[PDB]
């Protein structure tokens, strides 16, 4: 059984490929050919927020589409007011090597993590008029890459030990552990119904997980390098990815195969972040060539360019009402576009 | 603006004052990155070090300057996914064990990757060769032929030690980069002076380039 079981794995792999091939009859481009193009999209900078003295690595929008949080390597967390460009809080960090941050849907907590292998949770609305550390989550053997809030008492984290986890904040314990990846997990994205999530790793694959049962249901492999960003479609039946090979792709849950690729002969740099619009017609991506690009999600046609940064763009974000988009880069500045 | 709106702006400006003050205090620091294989005297490089697993930080002061040291040893993951964080460091310290033949051909591989990385094109390196006395006593039984098949010469203390240094220095391929080499034992105490003298030379070379001479 040392080598006999190897043949079984190969046979099952070819069985799945034949099933997907027989399920493909027409392409997305052919179906969408007789559709009016969106045209040209032009956006102008509206706000510029200053105060960070180092590179910016992550940001997150609040559910009210007015507040946001930003993390920098200077060991500071800042909560801004988008309308008035005002500073609400300034949170010092014990470790200055941070890589991710998140905002709770209720608006009472924020989270951060990095090279210390610990996820920290801060309490915003409490007596004494100050922000204090409420819980430190330990148990990962690698750096944290991303974290997202399910509720006020649950959080999902991805780490560099090829493992995802789900925690109970009050108990401080790891309720469920997700295993199966080969390379380091870099991204994370939650479904609108808060029942499934997808992740991208350095082995050029993406997986779909079950939160309640802790099992893997589908694996998508069509890339050629590390997958850095991932995002769900507003419908919840599709998702998009971005990799270091200067290419974006769209995958379908029900058809279980790739649908469309986004590429050009000029771009050679990698992709740091991806995001959708409120309707899903536009796809926004950030590159290392100092620019942000806008794609037509249905016709794969480039529609606009956002050029206002003099360093690498690292993070993106779209409000819940879909009124503005925010970009952060390594020049210690972040802007709001409309 | 309303009465409550005027008070909000006042609070925001007090935060700016504290943020500006914190930047000035943190700018008078020297940042160093510590690299090397396991069991190479990384934790005993300077006797007066104070600790301030993931990442370990250590700081000490000499003359009137503050030094901060970072030891990325507990990160057993893909190095290329977090190495760009330490892009603004002044220099890199690499430790090599002269009495460990097995770690050879492994320290050389790590040296080649760091010295030829995109984010470290113009960063100087300080090289420390440890266990000077242990290597001399051990070379009597093993004439350095186990590690390097191609080596000739009467190897008592000097030529063998000079051969290893030339092997490491051959990996440099940048005109704006320099390597500083020193040999230390477990009883040496003047290790802070060597780092101080090296960083003084690095800053001078940077300022010549702005003038246009270098």
């Amino acid at each position: 059984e040392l080598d006999q079981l190897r043949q079984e794995a190969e046979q099952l792999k070819n069985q799945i490929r034949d099933a997907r091939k027989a399920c493909a009859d027409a392409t997305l481009s052919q179906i969408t050919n007789n559709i009016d193009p969106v045209g040209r999209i032009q956006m102008r900078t509206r706000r510029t927020l200053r105060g960070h003295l180092a590179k910016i690595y992550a940001m997150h929008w609040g559910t009210d589409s007015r507040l946001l949080v930003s993390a920098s390597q200077d060991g500071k967390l800042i909560i801004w007011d988008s309308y008035t460009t005002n500073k609400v809080h300034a949170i010092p960090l014990r470790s200055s090597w941070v890589m991710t941050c998140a905002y709770a849907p209720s608006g009472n907590y924020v989270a951060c993590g990095g090279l210390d292998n610990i996820c920290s949770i801060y309490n915003l609305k409490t007596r004494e008029g100050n922000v204090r550390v409420s819980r430190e989550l330990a148990g990962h053997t690698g750096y944290l890459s991303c974290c997202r809030f399910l509720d006020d008492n649950q959080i999902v984290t991805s780490s560099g030990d090829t493992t995802c986890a789900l925690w109970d904040i009050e108990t401080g314990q790891q309720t469920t552990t997700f295993t199966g990846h080969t390379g380091d997990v870099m991204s994370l994205s939650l479904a609108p119904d808060t029942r499934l999530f997808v992740s991208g790793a350095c082995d050029a694959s993406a997986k779909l997980w079950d939160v309640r049962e802790g099992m893997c249901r589908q694996t998508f492999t069509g890339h050629e390098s590390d997958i850095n960003a991932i995002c769900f479609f507003p419908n919840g039946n599709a998702f998009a990815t971005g990799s270091d090979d200067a290419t974006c792709r769209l995958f379908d849950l029900r058809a279980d195969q790739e649908l469309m690729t986004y590429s050009h002969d000029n771009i050679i740099c990698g992709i740091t972040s991806v995001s959708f619009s409120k309707s899903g017609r536009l796809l926004l991506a950030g590159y290392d060539d100092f620019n942000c690009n806008v794609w037509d999600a249905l016709k794969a046609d480039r529609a606009g360019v956002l050029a206002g940064h003099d360093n690498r763009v690292s993070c993106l974000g779209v409000t819940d009402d879909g009124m503005a988009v925010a970009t952060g880069s390594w020049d210690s500045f972040l802007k709001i576009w409309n | 603006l309303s009465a409550e709106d005027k008070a909000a702006v006042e609070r925001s400006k007090m935060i700016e004052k504290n943020l500006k003050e914190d930047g000035i205090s943190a700018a008078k620091d020297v940042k160093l990155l510590l690299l090397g294989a396991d069991n190479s005297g990384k934790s005993t490089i300077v006797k007066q070090m104070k600790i301030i697993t993931g990442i370990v930080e250590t700081h000490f002061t000499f003359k009137n300057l503050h030094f901060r040291l970072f030891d990325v040893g507990g990160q057993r993951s893909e190095r290329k996914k977090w190495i760009h964080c330490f892009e603004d460091v002044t220099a890199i310290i690499f430790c090599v064990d002269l009495s460990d033949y097995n770690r050879m051909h492994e320290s050389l591989m790590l040296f080649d990757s760091i010295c030829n990385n995109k984010f470290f094109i113009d960063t100087s390196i300080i090289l420390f060769l440890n266990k000077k006395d242990l290597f001399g006593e051990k070379i009597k039984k093993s004439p350095l032929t186990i590690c390097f098949p191609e080596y000739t010469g009467p190897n008592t203390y000097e030529d063998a030690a000079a051969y290893i240094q030339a092997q490491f220095e051959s990996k440099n391929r940048s005109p704006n980069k320099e390597i500083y080499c020193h040999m230390t034992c477990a009883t040496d105490t003047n290790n802070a002076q060597v780092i101080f003298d090296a960083v003084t030379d690095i800053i001078i070379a940077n300022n010549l380039r702005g003038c246009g001479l270098y």
Partner: single-chain antibody, 230 residues
Framework: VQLVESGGGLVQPGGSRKLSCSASGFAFSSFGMHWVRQAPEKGLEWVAYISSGSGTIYYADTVKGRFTISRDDPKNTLFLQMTSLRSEDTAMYYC??????????????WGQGTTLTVSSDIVMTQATSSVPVPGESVSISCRSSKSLLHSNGNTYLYWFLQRPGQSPQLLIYRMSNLASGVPDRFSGSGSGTAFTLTISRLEAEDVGVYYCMQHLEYPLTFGAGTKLEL
């Protein structure tokens, strides 16, 4: 959170006195401070205000020129120096904390005060004075001279309750929001120049005097007050 006030006594007219307030249990340097006094048989009245960092000071027209307010952040103490005392300064003086940012709830904590004995404005009207009234719905109304609705979409109206032998506490801030640690049976709604406070399923520990306050512009003004009795 504690606020203990010290001072008081009997002072001949024309003398000078100072009051002190010690804070313990919260970050004192990040909070603004107010002085509010209450006459023996009247309502509340605002006196002075000092901002976080001692960068802004406001006074009332009655005590301007003879009252001084100061704070000592390292010692966590607040002072109020008063000179040329008259017979109209006999009242009980309270100390209030407040913080201002997006989503804040100022005037949240009050402290027991000390009794001192000496021996263009906006008008807020509460026509009702005494309402006889458990298990019933009660509505109280307040009126304003000018509209309290700013162009930014906020209405600056506050509600307070004072039980006998106690200190006032916050119930509603900005005319719609419910303060922390208050039962959901309290509700408040209204429009420009007209406001209403409604209580559903009235029970014990809900009898006292209710005050309506404006925070649109300095100086701050209160109402006459409405008393609920069984």
């Amino acid at each position: 959170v504690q606020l203990v006030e010290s001072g008081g006594g009997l002072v001949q007219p024309g003398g000078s006195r100072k009051l002190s307030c010690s804070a313990s249990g919260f970050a004192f340097s990040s909070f603004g401070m107010h002085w509010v006094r209450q006459a023996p048989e009247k309502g509340l009245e605002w006196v002075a205000y000092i901002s976080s960092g001692s960068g802004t000071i406001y006074y009332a027209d009655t005590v301007k020129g003879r009252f001084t307010i100061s704070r000592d952040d390292p010692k966590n103490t607040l002072f109020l120096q008063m000179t040329s005392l008259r017979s109209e300064d006999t009242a009980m003086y309270y100390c209030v904390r407040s913080i201002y940012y997006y989503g804040s709830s100022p005037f949240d904590f009050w402290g027991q005060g000390t009794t001192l004995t000496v021996s263009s404005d906006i008008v807020m009207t509460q026509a009702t004075s005494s309402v006889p009234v458990p298990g019933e719905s009660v509505s109280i109304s307040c009126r304003s001279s000018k509209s309290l609705l700013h162009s930014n979409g906020n209405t600056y109206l506050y509600w307070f309750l004072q039980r006998p032998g106690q200190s006032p506490q916050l119930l509603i801030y900005r005319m719609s929001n419910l303060a922390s640690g208050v039962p959901d049976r309290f509700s408040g709604s209204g429009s420009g120049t007209a406001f209403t406070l409604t209580i559903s399923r009235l029970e014990a520990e809900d009898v006292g005097v209710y005050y309506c306050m404006q925070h649109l512009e300095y100086p701050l003004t209160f109402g006459a007050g409405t008393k609920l009795e069984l």
